[PDB]
Amino acid sequence: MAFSSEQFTTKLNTLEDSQESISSASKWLLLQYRDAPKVAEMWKEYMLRPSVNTRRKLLGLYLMNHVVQQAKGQKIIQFQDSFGKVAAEVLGRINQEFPRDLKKKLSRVVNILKERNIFSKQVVNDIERSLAAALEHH
């Protein structure tokens, strides 16, 4: 079948920090448009596991970026929403395990998404205040 346990995870265990495998894996997810909320719950759980390091979170971070962008483009609103719904908490947690350097890279990706208006400006404020709380200072 097109679905199986941890298919998303084993994917991220094969991805690299660049658009080659990242965009390819994104297009797979963009074809799972029917199952977008299902794959989204697997995405958050995958990176929420500490059974994977910040490097693994960084791959999935780039993967999400290109997935939500393409979904925003055509008409796969289910994906930009399904990832946007978890993005506030999820990205908010990445800031709690990333070194300041990866936090800056993540922040840029988040900004680029905000500028592209990928998520709703409402969901953006959820991500913003979440990452803001995850600045570890106030």
Partner: peptide, 16 residues
Amino acid sequence: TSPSYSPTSPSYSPTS
């Protein structure tokens, strides 16, 4: 593979 990458360059409205 790990070619060049800048998250502001890839798709956003590539097709309907």
